[PDB]
Amino acid sequence: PLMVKVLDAVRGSPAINVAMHVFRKGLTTEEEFVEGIYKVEIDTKSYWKALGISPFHEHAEVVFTANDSGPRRYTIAALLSPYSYSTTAVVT
Amino acid sequence: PLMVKVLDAVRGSPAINVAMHVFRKGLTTEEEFVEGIYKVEIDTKSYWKALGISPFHEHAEVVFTANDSGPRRYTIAALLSPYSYSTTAVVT
Amino acid sequence: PLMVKVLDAVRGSPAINVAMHVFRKGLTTEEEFVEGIYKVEIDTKSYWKALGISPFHEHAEVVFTANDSGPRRYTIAALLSPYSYSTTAVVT
Amino acid sequence: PLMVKVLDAVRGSPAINVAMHVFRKGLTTEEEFVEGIYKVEIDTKSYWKALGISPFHEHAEVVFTANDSGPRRYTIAALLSPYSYSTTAVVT
Amino acid sequence: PLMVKVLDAVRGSPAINVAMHVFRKGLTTEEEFVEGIYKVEIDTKSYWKALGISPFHEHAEVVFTANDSGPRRYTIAALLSPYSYSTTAVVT
Amino acid sequence: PLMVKVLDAVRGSPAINVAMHVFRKGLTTEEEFVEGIYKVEIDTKSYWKALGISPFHEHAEVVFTANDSGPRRYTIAALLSPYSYSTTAVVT
Amino acid sequence: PLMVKVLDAVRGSPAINVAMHVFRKGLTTEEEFVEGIYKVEIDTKSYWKALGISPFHEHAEVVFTANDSGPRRYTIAALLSPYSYSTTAVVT
Amino acid sequence: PLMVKVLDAVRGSPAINVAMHVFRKGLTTEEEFVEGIYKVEIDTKSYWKALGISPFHEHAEVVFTANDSGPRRYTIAALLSPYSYSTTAVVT
Amino acid sequence: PLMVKVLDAVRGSPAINVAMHVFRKGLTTEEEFVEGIYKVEIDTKSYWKALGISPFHEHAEVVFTANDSGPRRYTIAALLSPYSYSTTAVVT
Amino acid sequence: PLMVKVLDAVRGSPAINVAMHVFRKGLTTEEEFVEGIYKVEIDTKSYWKALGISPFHEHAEVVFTANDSGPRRYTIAALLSPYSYSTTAVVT
Amino acid sequence: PLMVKVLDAVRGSPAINVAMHVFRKGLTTEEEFVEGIYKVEIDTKSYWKALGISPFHEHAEVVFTANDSGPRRYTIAALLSPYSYSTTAVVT
Amino acid sequence: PLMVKVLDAVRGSPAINVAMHVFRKGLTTEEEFVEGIYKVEIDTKSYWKALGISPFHEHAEVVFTANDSGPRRYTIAALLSPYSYSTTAVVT
Amino acid sequence: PLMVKVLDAVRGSPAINVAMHVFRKGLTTEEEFVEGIYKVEIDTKSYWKALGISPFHEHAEVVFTANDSGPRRYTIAALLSPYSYSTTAVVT
Amino acid sequence: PLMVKVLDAVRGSPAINVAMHVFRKGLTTEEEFVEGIYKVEIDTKSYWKALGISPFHEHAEVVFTANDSGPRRYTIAALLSPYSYSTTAVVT
């Protein structure tokens, strides 16, 4: 007799971010990547990746180089932040 | 007797972001990538990726180079943020 | 006796972003990419990707180079953010 | 006895983005790409991609080069953001 | 006894974006690409792609070069954002 | 006789971030990456990764170099912080 | 006879971040990475990682170098901090 | 006052093999082959020869195969052997 | 006052093999082959020869195979052997 | 006052093999091969020869195979052996 | 006042093998091979020879195999052996 | 006042083997091979030779294999042995 | 006043082997091989030889195998042995 | 006033083996091999040899194996042994 009641009545003007779910029940490589409900990626970097069985097995000569420079100003505000009657401002 | 009641009545002007889902139930490589409900990717980078069984198996000579520069100003506001009666501003 | 009631009555002028779904019940390579409900990709980059069984198996000589420069100003506001009675402004 | 009731009555002028779906039930390569409901891609880039069984198997000599420059100003507002009675403005 | 009731009555002038679906139940390469419901791609780029079984199998010498420059100003507003009684403006 | 009642009635204008989910029930490599409900990644970096059985097994000569410079000013505010009647400001 | 009642009635304007979930019940490598409910990663770095069985097994000569410099000013405020009637300000 | 006197007088019937000589005094490839005085080549073989600057410079894939069989009976006698009053015989 | 006197007088029938000589005094490849006075080559073989500057410089994949079989009976007699009053015989 | 007197007078029938000489006085590859006076080569073999500057410089994959079989009976007699009044015989 | 007198007078029938001579006086590879006076090579073999500056410089993978079998009966007599009044015989 | 007198007079039938001589006076590789006067090589073998500057410099993987079998009966007699009035015999 | 007198007079039939000579006077690799007067090589073997500066400098993996079997019966007699009035015999 | 008198007169039939000579006078590798007057090598073996500067400098993994079997009957007689009036016999 499952039952879920969220936010059954709302008099007013909220700022809601609702997420949910109700559940009721030889050689091989694999990359499973299952994502979620909310996500905010900014400037994500995944430079190098070698995935599998026996990569670079013999005599592999790998030269990696990742120089990072440059003034990266992330002036951020109100991420995943539902607001009400509020004043979000970004100035420069 | 499953039952889900979300936001059954809303008097007013809310800023909602609803997401849900109710459930009731030889050699091989594989890349499964199943996505979610909400997503905001900005400047995501995945430079290099070797996926499979035995890549670069023998004598692989890999030279990688990722120089990153340049002033990247991310002046961001109100991501995944449903707002009400509010004032979001970005100035420069 | 499954039952879902979302937002059954709405007196007013909201800003809603609803997403849902109710469910009731030899050599080989594969790239499955199943997407979701919402998505906002901006300047996404996937430079290099070698996917499969035994790529670059022998004597592979790979020279990679990714220089990144240039002032990329992302002046962003109100992504996936349904708003009501509000004032979103971007100025330069 | 499945049943879904979303937004059964709406007195007013809302800005809704509804998406749903109710469910009730030798050598080989494959690229399945199933898309979803909503999507907003801007300046997406997928430079290089080698997909299959044994690409570049022998003596492969690959020289990659991706220089990125140039001031790319993304002045964006109100993506996937149904708004009501609001004022969205972009100035330069 | 499936049943779906969305937006059964609407007194007013809403800006709706409704999408739904209800469902009730030797060598080989393949590229399946099944698309979604609402979509907005802008400046999407997929420069290179080699898909199949054993491409570039032997002695493949591949020289890639992607220089990107030029000030690309994306001044965007109201994507997938049904609005009501609102004022969307873009100035330069 | 499961039962969940969250936020059953809301008189007022709250700034809520709700997330929930109720549950009721030879050689091999694998990378499972299942994501959560909320996430805000900014400037995440995963430079190098070698995942699988016996990578770099013999005589592997790997030279890594990651120089990091450049004044990165992250001037951030109100991440995953739903606020009400408030004033969030970022100035430079 | 499970039962959960959170925030059953809210008269007022609260900034709450409610995240909950009720539960009621040969060679091999594996990387499981299951994520949680909330997360805010900023400038996370995972430079080098070599998970697997017998990586670098013989004669591996690895030279690593990670120089870190550059004045990174993280001027941050109000992370995962839902506030009400407050005043969050960042100035430079 | 050079002077050479060979075999100045010969009373008799000699079998002579006389040979003499008295002497008194950018990119480029070259094969000089100056021969001498006497020579008896039999079944000489020079199967393969790549002569020059940078032959087979790149990706050259050369498959060579020289099977040698067959009963080659060289029943030889009196090569470069001037005889006198003698009896040379070859029988089978 | 050079002077050479060989075999100045010969009473009789000799079997002579006389040979004499009196002397009195950018990129580039070269094969000089100057021969001698007497020579008897039989079944000489020079199967494979790469001569020059930088042959097979890159990725050269050379498969060589020289099987040698077959009863080769060299029944030889009196090579470069001037004889007199003698009896040279070869029988089978 | 150089003087050379060999075999000045020969009464009789000798089997002589006389040989004499009196003497009185950027990138580059080279194969000089100067031969002499007498030579008897039989079944000489020079299977493989890479001569020059930087042959097989990179990634060279060379597979060599020289199987030698077959009864090779060299029944030889009187090589470079001037004989007199003698009896040289080869029987089978 | 040089002077050489060899075999000035020969009464009789000798088997002589006379040899003599009187003397009176950037990147680069080179193979000089100067031969002498007498030589009898039989079944000489020089299977493999890499000659030059930096052959096989990088990643060279060389597989050599020289199986030698087969009854090789060298029944030889009187090599470089001038004989007189003698009896040289080879029987089988 | 140099003077050389060898074998000035020979009454009789000798078997001589005379050999004599009177004398009176950047990167680089080189193979000088100067030969002498007499030589009898039989079944000489020089299987493998890497002669030069930095051959096989990096990651060279060399597999050598020289199996030797087969009854090789060298039944030899009278090599470089000038004989007189003698009886040289080889029987099988 | 040099002077050499060898074998000035020979009454008889000697078996002589005379060999005499009168004398009166950046990176680099080199193989000088100057030979002598007499030489009898039989079944000489020089299997492997890496001659030069820094061969096999890095990560060289060399597998050598030499199996030597097979009844080799060297039934030899009278090498470099000039004989007179003698009887040399080889029987099987 | 140098003077050498060897064997000035020989009445008889001697088996002599005479050998004489009268004398009266940056990085680098080198193999000088000067030979003598007489030499009889039989079944000489020089299996493995790395002569040079810094061979196998780093991580060299060398596996050597020399199995020696096979009856090798060296039934030899009269090497470098000039004999007179004698009887040399080899029987099997």
Side-chain angles (χ1 to χ4, degrees), chain G residues 29-52:
Chain G
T29 177
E30 173 167 350
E31 183 178 2
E32 202 147 325
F33 186 96
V34 176
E35 291 178 353
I37 303 301
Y38 295 93
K39 166 188 258 175
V40 181
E41 312 210 299
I42 300 177
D43 193 45
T44 307
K45 316 185 192 186
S46 164
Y47 281 73
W48 203 92
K49 157 169 180 168
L51 177 63

Short mmCIF file of all heavy atoms in Angstrom, two decimals, chain G residues 29-52:
data_model
loop_
_atom_site.label_atom_id
_atom_site.label_comp_id
_atom_site.label_asym_id
_atom_site.label_seq_id
_atom_site.Cartn_x
_atom_site.Cartn_y
_atom_site.Cartn_z
N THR G 29 38.73 -6.41 -12.48
CA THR G 29 38.86 -5.12 -11.84
C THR G 29 37.54 -4.38 -11.95
O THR G 29 36.69 -4.72 -12.77
CB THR G 29 39.99 -4.28 -12.43
OG1 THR G 29 40.02 -3.00 -11.80
CG2 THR G 29 39.81 -4.09 -13.87
N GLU G 30 37.38 -3.36 -11.11
CA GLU G 30 36.11 -2.68 -11.03
C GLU G 30 36.30 -1.35 -10.33
O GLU G 30 36.99 -1.27 -9.31
CB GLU G 30 35.08 -3.53 -10.28
CG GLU G 30 33.78 -2.83 -10.00
CD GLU G 30 32.70 -3.79 -9.56
OE1 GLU G 30 32.92 -5.01 -9.66
OE2 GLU G 30 31.63 -3.32 -9.11
N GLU G 31 35.70 -0.30 -10.88
CA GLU G 31 35.64 1.01 -10.24
C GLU G 31 34.17 1.37 -10.19
O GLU G 31 33.60 1.81 -11.19
CB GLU G 31 36.44 2.04 -11.00
CG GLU G 31 36.49 3.42 -10.35
CD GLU G 31 37.34 4.46 -11.09
OE1 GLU G 31 37.90 4.16 -12.16
OE2 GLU G 31 37.44 5.59 -10.58
N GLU G 32 33.56 1.20 -9.03
CA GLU G 32 32.23 1.72 -8.80
C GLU G 32 32.35 3.09 -8.16
O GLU G 32 33.14 3.28 -7.24
CB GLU G 32 31.43 0.77 -7.91
CG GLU G 32 29.94 0.91 -8.04
CD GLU G 32 29.23 -0.41 -7.84
OE1 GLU G 32 29.79 -1.45 -8.26
OE2 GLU G 32 28.12 -0.42 -7.27
N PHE G 33 31.58 4.05 -8.66
CA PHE G 33 31.57 5.41 -8.13
C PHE G 33 30.10 5.80 -8.12
O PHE G 33 29.57 6.26 -9.13
CB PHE G 33 32.43 6.34 -8.97
CG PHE G 33 32.58 7.73 -8.40
CD1 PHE G 33 33.69 8.04 -7.64
CD2 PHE G 33 31.66 8.72 -8.64
CE1 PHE G 33 33.85 9.31 -7.13
CE2 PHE G 33 31.81 9.98 -8.13
CZ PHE G 33 32.91 10.28 -7.38
N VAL G 34 29.45 5.63 -6.98
CA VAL G 34 28.06 6.02 -6.82
C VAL G 34 28.05 7.35 -6.08
O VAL G 34 28.68 7.49 -5.03
CB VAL G 34 27.27 4.96 -6.05
CG1 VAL G 34 25.86 5.44 -5.79
CG2 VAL G 34 27.27 3.65 -6.81
N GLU G 35 27.33 8.32 -6.62
CA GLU G 35 27.26 9.64 -6.00
C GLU G 35 26.07 9.83 -5.06
O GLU G 35 25.14 9.03 -5.06
CB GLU G 35 27.28 10.73 -7.07
CG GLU G 35 28.62 10.85 -7.77
CD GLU G 35 28.60 11.90 -8.86
OE1 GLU G 35 27.50 12.43 -9.14
OE2 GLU G 35 29.66 12.20 -9.44
N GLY G 36 26.12 10.90 -4.27
CA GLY G 36 25.07 11.19 -3.31
C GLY G 36 23.99 12.15 -3.75
O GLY G 36 23.68 12.25 -4.93
N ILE G 37 23.42 12.86 -2.79
CA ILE G 37 22.35 13.81 -3.05
C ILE G 37 22.83 15.22 -3.40
O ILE G 37 22.42 15.78 -4.41
CB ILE G 37 21.38 13.91 -1.84
CG1 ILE G 37 20.82 12.53 -1.51
CG2 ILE G 37 20.26 14.89 -2.13
CD1 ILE G 37 20.06 11.89 -2.65
N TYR G 38 23.68 15.80 -2.57
CA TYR G 38 24.17 17.14 -2.84
C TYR G 38 25.68 17.14 -3.02
O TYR G 38 26.37 16.31 -2.43
CB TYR G 38 23.77 18.10 -1.72
CG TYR G 38 22.27 18.31 -1.60
CD1 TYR G 38 21.51 17.53 -0.74
CD2 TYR G 38 21.63 19.28 -2.35
CE1 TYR G 38 20.15 17.71 -0.63
CE2 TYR G 38 20.27 19.47 -2.24
CZ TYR G 38 19.53 18.68 -1.38
OH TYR G 38 18.18 18.87 -1.27
N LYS G 39 26.20 18.07 -3.82
CA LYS G 39 27.63 18.11 -4.02
C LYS G 39 27.96 19.44 -4.67
O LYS G 39 27.21 19.90 -5.52
CB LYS G 39 28.11 16.92 -4.85
CG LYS G 39 29.50 17.07 -5.39
CD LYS G 39 29.84 15.97 -6.37
CE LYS G 39 30.71 14.92 -5.73
NZ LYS G 39 30.94 13.77 -6.64
N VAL G 40 29.05 20.04 -4.24
CA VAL G 40 29.54 21.28 -4.84
C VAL G 40 31.06 21.17 -4.89
O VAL G 40 31.74 21.46 -3.90
CB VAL G 40 29.11 22.54 -4.08
CG1 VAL G 40 29.63 23.77 -4.77
CG2 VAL G 40 27.61 22.60 -3.95
N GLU G 41 31.59 20.76 -6.03
CA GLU G 41 33.03 20.63 -6.19
C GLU G 41 33.55 21.82 -6.97
O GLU G 41 32.98 22.18 -8.00
CB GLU G 41 33.38 19.33 -6.90
CG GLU G 41 32.69 18.13 -6.32
CD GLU G 41 33.49 16.86 -6.47
OE1 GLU G 41 33.77 16.46 -7.61
OE2 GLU G 41 33.84 16.26 -5.44
N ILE G 42 34.62 22.43 -6.49
CA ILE G 42 35.21 23.60 -7.14
C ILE G 42 36.72 23.41 -7.16
O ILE G 42 37.34 23.23 -6.11
CB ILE G 42 34.84 24.91 -6.43
CG1 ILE G 42 33.33 25.10 -6.43
CG2 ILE G 42 35.51 26.08 -7.10
CD1 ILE G 42 32.89 26.32 -5.69
N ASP G 43 37.30 23.46 -8.35
CA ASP G 43 38.74 23.29 -8.55
C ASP G 43 39.24 21.95 -8.04
O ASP G 43 40.43 21.81 -7.73
CB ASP G 43 39.53 24.43 -7.90
CG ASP G 43 40.97 24.46 -8.35
OD1 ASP G 43 41.22 24.32 -9.56
OD2 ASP G 43 41.87 24.63 -7.50
N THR G 44 38.37 20.96 -7.94
CA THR G 44 38.81 19.61 -7.65
C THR G 44 39.82 19.16 -8.69
O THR G 44 39.67 19.43 -9.88
CB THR G 44 37.62 18.66 -7.63
OG1 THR G 44 36.62 19.16 -6.74
CG2 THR G 44 38.04 17.27 -7.19
N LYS G 45 40.87 18.48 -8.23
CA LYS G 45 41.87 17.96 -9.14
C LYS G 45 42.25 16.56 -8.71
O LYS G 45 42.47 16.31 -7.53
CB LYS G 45 43.12 18.84 -9.17
CG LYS G 45 42.83 20.32 -9.24
CD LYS G 45 44.11 21.09 -9.38
CE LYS G 45 43.90 22.57 -9.17
NZ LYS G 45 45.15 23.33 -9.44
N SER G 46 42.30 15.64 -9.67
CA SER G 46 42.80 14.28 -9.45
C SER G 46 43.80 14.09 -10.57
O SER G 46 43.43 13.66 -11.67
CB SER G 46 41.68 13.27 -9.49
OG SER G 46 42.20 11.96 -9.64
N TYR G 47 45.06 14.40 -10.30
CA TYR G 47 46.05 14.49 -11.36
C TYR G 47 46.36 13.15 -12.00
O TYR G 47 46.22 12.97 -13.21
CB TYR G 47 47.36 15.06 -10.83
CG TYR G 47 47.31 16.54 -10.66
CD1 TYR G 47 46.58 17.11 -9.65
CD2 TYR G 47 47.99 17.37 -11.53
CE1 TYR G 47 46.53 18.47 -9.50
CE2 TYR G 47 47.94 18.73 -11.38
CZ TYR G 47 47.21 19.27 -10.36
OH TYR G 47 47.15 20.63 -10.19
N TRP G 48 46.81 12.18 -11.20
CA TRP G 48 47.20 10.88 -11.75
C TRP G 48 46.53 9.71 -11.01
O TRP G 48 46.48 9.70 -9.81
CB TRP G 48 48.72 10.77 -11.63
CG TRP G 48 49.38 9.81 -12.56
CD1 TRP G 48 49.89 10.07 -13.80
CD2 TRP G 48 49.64 8.43 -12.31
NE1 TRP G 48 50.45 8.94 -14.34
CE2 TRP G 48 50.30 7.91 -13.44
CE3 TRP G 48 49.38 7.57 -11.23
CZ2 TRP G 48 50.69 6.58 -13.54
CZ3 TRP G 48 49.77 6.25 -11.33
CH2 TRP G 48 50.42 5.77 -12.47
N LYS G 49 46.01 8.72 -11.72
CA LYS G 49 45.38 7.60 -11.04
C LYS G 49 45.53 6.41 -11.95
O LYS G 49 45.25 6.56 -13.14
CB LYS G 49 43.91 7.89 -10.78
CG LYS G 49 43.05 6.65 -10.61
CD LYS G 49 41.66 7.00 -10.10
CE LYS G 49 40.80 5.76 -9.94
NZ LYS G 49 39.55 6.04 -9.18
N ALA G 50 45.95 5.26 -11.40
CA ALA G 50 46.16 4.06 -12.25
C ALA G 50 45.55 2.85 -11.55
O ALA G 50 46.31 1.95 -11.14
CB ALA G 50 47.62 3.85 -12.54
N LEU G 51 44.22 2.83 -11.43
CA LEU G 51 43.50 1.69 -10.79
C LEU G 51 43.53 0.50 -11.75
O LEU G 51 43.47 0.73 -12.97
CB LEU G 51 42.06 2.11 -10.48
CG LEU G 51 41.17 1.02 -9.89
CD1 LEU G 51 41.70 0.57 -8.54
CD2 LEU G 51 39.74 1.50 -9.76
N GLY G 52 43.64 -0.72 -11.22
CA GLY G 52 43.66 -1.93 -12.06
C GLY G 52 44.54 -3.01 -11.48
O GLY G 52 45.17 -2.77 -10.43
#
